[PDB]
Paper text:
In the type II CRISPR-Cas9 system, the crRNA (CRISPR RNA):tracrRNA (trans-activating crRNA)-guided Cas9 degrades double-stranded DNA (dsDNA) bearing a [name] (protospacer-adjacent motif) and an adjacent 20-nt sequence complementary to the crRNA. Two endonuclease domains (HNH and RuvC) in the NUC lobe connected by an arginine-rich bridge helix (BH) and a [name]-interacting (PI) domain are used to cleave the target and non-target strand of dsDNA, respectively. One of the variants is called [name] 3.7 (carrying 7 point mutations, A262T, R324L, S409I, E480K, E543D, M694I and E1219V, compared with wild-type (WT) [name]) with the broadest compatibility for 5′-NG-3′, 5′-GAA-3,′ and 5′-GAT-3′ [name] sequences in mammalian cells. Remarkably, in addition to expanded [name] compatibility, [name] 3.7 has much greater substrate specificity and substantially lower off-target effect at both 5′-NGG-3′ and non-5′-NGG-3′ [name] sites in human cells.
To provide structural insights into the molecular mechanisms underlying expanded [name] recognition and improved cleavage fidelity of [name] 3.7, we determined the crystal structures of [name] 3.7 in complex with a 100-nucleotides (nt) [name], a 28-nt target DNA strand and an 11-nt non-target DNA strand containing either 5′-GAT-3′ [name] or 5′-[name]-3′ [name] sequence, at 2.7 and 3.0 Å resolutions, respectively. Since the two structures are virtually identical (root-mean-square deviation [RMSD] of 0.29 Å for 1208 equivalent Cα atoms), we mainly discuss the quaternary complexstructure containing the 5′-GAT-3′ [name] unless otherwise stated. Interestingly, however, structural superposition of 5′-GAT-3′ [name]-bound [name] 3.7 (referred to as [name] 3.7/GAT) or 5′-[name]-3′ [name]-bound [name] 3.7 (referred to as [name] 3.7/[name]) with WT [name] revealed that their PI domains have nearly identical conformations. This structural observation indicates that conformational changes in the PI domain of [name] 3.7 are unlikely to be responsible for their broader [name] recognition. Mutation of E1219 to Val disrupts salt bridges with R1335, making it possible for the latter residue to adopt multiple rotamer conformations. The relaxed R1335 in [name] 3.7 also allows the side chain of R1333, which packs tightly against the E1219-stabilized R1335 in WT [name], to move more freely. Consistently, compared to that in WT [name] structure, the side chain of R1333 in the structure of [name] 3.7/[name] rotates about 30 degrees to contact the nucleobase of dA2*. Taken together, our results show that the rotamer flexibility of R1335 is an important determinant for the recognition specificity of [name] by [name]. E1219V mutation in [name] 3.7 promotes the rotamer flexibility of R1335, thus allowing [name] 3.7 to have a broader [name] compatibility than WT [name].
Author numbering: 4 to 712, 719 to 765, 777 to 1011, 1031 to 1243, 1249 to 1366
Amino acid sequence: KYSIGLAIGTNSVGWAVITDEYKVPSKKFKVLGNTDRHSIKKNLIGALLFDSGETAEATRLKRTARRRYTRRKNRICYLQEIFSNEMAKVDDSFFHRLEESFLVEEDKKHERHPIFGNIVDEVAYHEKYPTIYHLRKKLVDSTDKADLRLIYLALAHMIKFRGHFLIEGDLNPDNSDVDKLFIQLVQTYNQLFEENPINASGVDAKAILSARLSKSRRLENLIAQLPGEKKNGLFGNLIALSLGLTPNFKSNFDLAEDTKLQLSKDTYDDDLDNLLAQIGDQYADLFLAAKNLSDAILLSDILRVNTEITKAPLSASMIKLYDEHHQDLTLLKALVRQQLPEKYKEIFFDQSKNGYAGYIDGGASQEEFYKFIKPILEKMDGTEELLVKLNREDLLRKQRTFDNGIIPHQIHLGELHAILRRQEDFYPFLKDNREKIEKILTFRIPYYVGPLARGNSRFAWMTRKSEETITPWNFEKVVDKGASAQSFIERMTNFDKNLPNEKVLPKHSLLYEYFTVYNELTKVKYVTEGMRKPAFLSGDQKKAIVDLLFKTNRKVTVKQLKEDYFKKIECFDSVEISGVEDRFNASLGTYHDLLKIIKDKDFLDNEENEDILEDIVLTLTLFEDREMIEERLKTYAHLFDDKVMKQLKRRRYTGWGRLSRKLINGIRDKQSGKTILDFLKSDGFANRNFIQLIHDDSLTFKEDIQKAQSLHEHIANLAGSPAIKKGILQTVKVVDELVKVMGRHKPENIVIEMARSRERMKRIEEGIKELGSQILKEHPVENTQLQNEKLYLYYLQNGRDMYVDQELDINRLSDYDVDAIVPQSFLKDDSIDNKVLTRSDKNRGKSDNVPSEEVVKKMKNYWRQLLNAKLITQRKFDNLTKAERGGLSELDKAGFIKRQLVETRQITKHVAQILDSRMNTKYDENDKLIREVKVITLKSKLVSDFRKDFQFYKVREINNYHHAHDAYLNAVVGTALIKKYPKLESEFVYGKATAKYFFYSNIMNFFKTEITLANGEIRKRPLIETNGETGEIVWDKGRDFATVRKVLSMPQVNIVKKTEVQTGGFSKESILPKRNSDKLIARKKDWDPKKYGGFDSPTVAYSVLVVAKVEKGKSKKLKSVKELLGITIMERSSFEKNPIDFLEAKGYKEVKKDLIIKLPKYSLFELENGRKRMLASAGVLQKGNELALPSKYVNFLYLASHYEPEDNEQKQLFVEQHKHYLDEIIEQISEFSKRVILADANLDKVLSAYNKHRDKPIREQAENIIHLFTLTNLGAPAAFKYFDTTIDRKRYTSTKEVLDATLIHQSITGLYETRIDLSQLG
RNA sequence: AACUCAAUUUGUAAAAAAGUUUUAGAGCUAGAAAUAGCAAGUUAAAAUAAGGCUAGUCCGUUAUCAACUUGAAAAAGUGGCACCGAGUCGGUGCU
DNA sequence: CAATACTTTTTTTTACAAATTGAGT
DNA sequence: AAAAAGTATTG
């Protein structure tokens, strides 16, 4: 008879076995291998360590980008294949040269100049066209014939870097002058508003709309020059459209629902046509001149510099940059020499220096270039004209930059389209493909169709209409984009928990909505004067109410039910209704939705079209792309008016239900034949409902449901971090093994415990914009300073107090307080979501609750604004104002303190279910569950407090035993608590308010001896705690506080580190230049790294013990070796397939194939004096020993560090009473390090530094000594400091020593071993 | 168990702009030579996990892994119990 | 050999679905 | 976003 405690985490799983005496047993264990010892003694406690589980994100993020690389590639293959035939007549080496452009002349198979094929014709090209964009403007403006190759260059360049698809629609070239397109709008506006014109006299539109300012600010600045017009006015909203915003036109026109417009969405066309069909085509000429403005503002929002009107504005802009870059560089050189010859070298030559040299040829960010060279131009004279060019980031611009991420594909297209429109007259195959080429640029695989696979992709759901190779041209005629677009969602959508072979309906199916109504209705009761007992509605009554009421009103009110039905129908003058209040919660909203559209109640009420409407709601719910919806609904084009169909593809539904069709109106009960909904429609006078129906054993619903229906697969399908799913998984195999260790005897209780900058910038940046506070200019900052909690809050609260309507001075934050909104006396939540910054934390009101109602009633409006700017959360807002909604009641304050001891978390409940399911597998006569084992769930408060309450302090930095100590105490506290209060097996095991408050507040008291309650009393519970009902003793406070104190002193604890073959990337991702080292890896087969460069630092999958021979010396004679060889992730599959051929290829002769031992990372070797080492790779090691530091030093270290009740003296005096423990600890460390660490060089720097600080206060040494365990911590040598004396790490950089050592194959608990002497090989 | 709202986490797809690496952008004068003085510099092609077979405008970095026997694989199978004590586990007795 | 010091890919957008928690009902 | 292995140069 025993029990198991488990402590579950991301990088650890602690475990312990205890007896009814709260003791941890020990056992002899058979030892395997070639060693002498065939047995060993171990304690049935321990832990398990492992590296964290990883999200499938980076893996995906790479993959997603591989497909982009494998498609931009084909965009060229498509383009080259076209030019191919007519290109041959000019140069049958051209495309072949572009391929081998990368190879060195010594390996090129054609002339070394790529574009033309001599050098005098090529050099002249680079002089006429210093940049590609020169060739772009030329191939557009000029009319003369052009060289076909020049053309492929300009075209592919636009295709290889096509720009983004965040804008929908065509952009018109001719739309270019802001100042004029604006004026033609005012004139167009004035045409309809002759009564109220707009005097745009002297309004610099080009200054206000094209400035490098926020879209909103440009609007506010533009309206500010129009005295009379409002921001959310029509013209206001119209400019808001031009600037790229999404305004609302409800108020301007007195409409019903909100009508929004965005010129970038695909809906603007149809969303405008829905508006003009509501205000009149008189305004069509308005929303167009507004668009032409957007098309001119986009450009000014794209070009860094302004320029002459052309047909290639982008390509012309960069020319104006190159020309300026050229212009301003000629100046600087000559400018610098004439005033700073002491530098010209370092600037224009030294690539190591972040000057103009390292700018171009080194790797100097545009930022790093300015940051360095700015004070120079400040020193000299005549540079001021260039300081401007710097501070707007227009000084020596490269053309291929990071800011070019804004360029939409439309800009590029208008140039690619132009070039074709020039040379198609000269080259006729162009005109034949002018569409075919532009399609390549504009084509883009929709997100909802997915990979263009053909059965070999587990990421694919696409359905092929044809069979042939998909191309950008036949995509519509080969891909059923639609049947695939529906698969896209149907994959992720859920199933019916009661019918796990049935998909669930959309949230707005008429069937679900009917089903809701009857389910609510079948529970209404009525009675009036003349009735013996309140009655139930019958089938005939319900069908009436749905017809007369629900299909006539969206919301059905009780007042309606009485005077519209019982009065006007059943002739009841008076009646009393039971089973519903105020109004019904249910509605047929989708029915009224359609009735307001198709305007034919006869068609809707007609039972024949039941299948149709659901498909309409499905199509509406299932898709999001208007083109994909109009396609799916044009099957009902012959059925509804075109005006209807138009207003039909504009309705949207979001949601997926929990229920299927086959459930409610599909399955039937056996002897009745009625469906569930049929039952809801009528059920004699039982009027049962859903929950009552799926359960009545009286009916054939229960059995047929419960007639429906791996391990690691079962866990990966849980919800939660993959890290915890790893720890959750390894938890079972531990329990499954420990059960075996205990002779297949299932335990009785299994206690478990589960452990609990850039982003901050935009958060504030956004919120401040919504409020227009110049606080940013008033107080600029940097995203690495927003870690200062207080400072982060000043900007969240926009510099004002959160409890008092007055401001805060940023300079005085140290004085200001950070108050818990809901106090940590109830739930702990040091998080921004439950904290504010106030000058005095006393202005919140009473400290025993939530901010007082006098605060809410004064600061609510400010808080509301903080929510409209997303500067607080609705949660935070909810708690800030709880007072006016009743505050935290004394009943509320009981759950907060109850939830400190009860695992509310779901993932934790799932583990308990899995364990309870694996243990309890026996069934009795009446088909009930036989519960051999009780699975207990605890929160980490129980033990974290238990330690502090009884001097069992934990210092994590000493070792990894403390994981195992926690799993122990969890078994202790968990079992003892169920023994004492067995009535709480409902809140802890799987299967007047102030009473609850003082109960859960004082539940763990029974361990304590002297109970001191804050209302002045001493109450001593006895020495032995016993159960009231059962006679079992549960806690002898004489023995069991030493039973535990001894267990935590045990020096042998099974610490096991999971042996893990390393997966992932091949090496470091950095591509390195050519150097002559055998360590570079070929980027491509035929790419000698010594010539082209390559990769470096490969990651090792595992190592192998390779006992073989090598050709030593000139005589090619064999010398026996016992080397340790590293298998890199890339080399892996090649090795496993045939290892002997793999090894001999490395110079390994006469390989003993039988002694190739696979050594994963963290493989464990033991050597002399019990020193243990772990493997990190073929030639690096890690420490493999734990320090069983005695307990008295632990608590002393804890207390001497935490020098922060009146029982603190006994604790605080003990410190200065046992100060000699210091030098004793330093000897505890040393005499250990000298034995298993072997950092003699570093150990000096510790003994030299501890001594040097002996004078320092007892606490300051207490702390900095905890740091010393870094020298002794299991794992990899890390760096650490003592006071301010850094101690860099000593690394074990040769694994040669473990080859004559002893290999330790550890079970998951480290109990079952297998010991291999690697000296007996060879 | 419902509903509403909001936040978090996980998982999939579609896109863009960088970055790096070789090559192409004839460097000129002087000096035997290293070295000096000048000139220039912004762009492009190509690769972007080696690569794989099932040959797709697809797949290639997540999850899972002690040893041994058995298996394609998933996975199954394999190691006695009590007491005393404790510096990483010893010692003792029993079948 | 041991000591020492340097390096290690990045940024942005669109679209969907599921739990899960936490506060209102 | 650091841990810590890979790499190189120096004692």
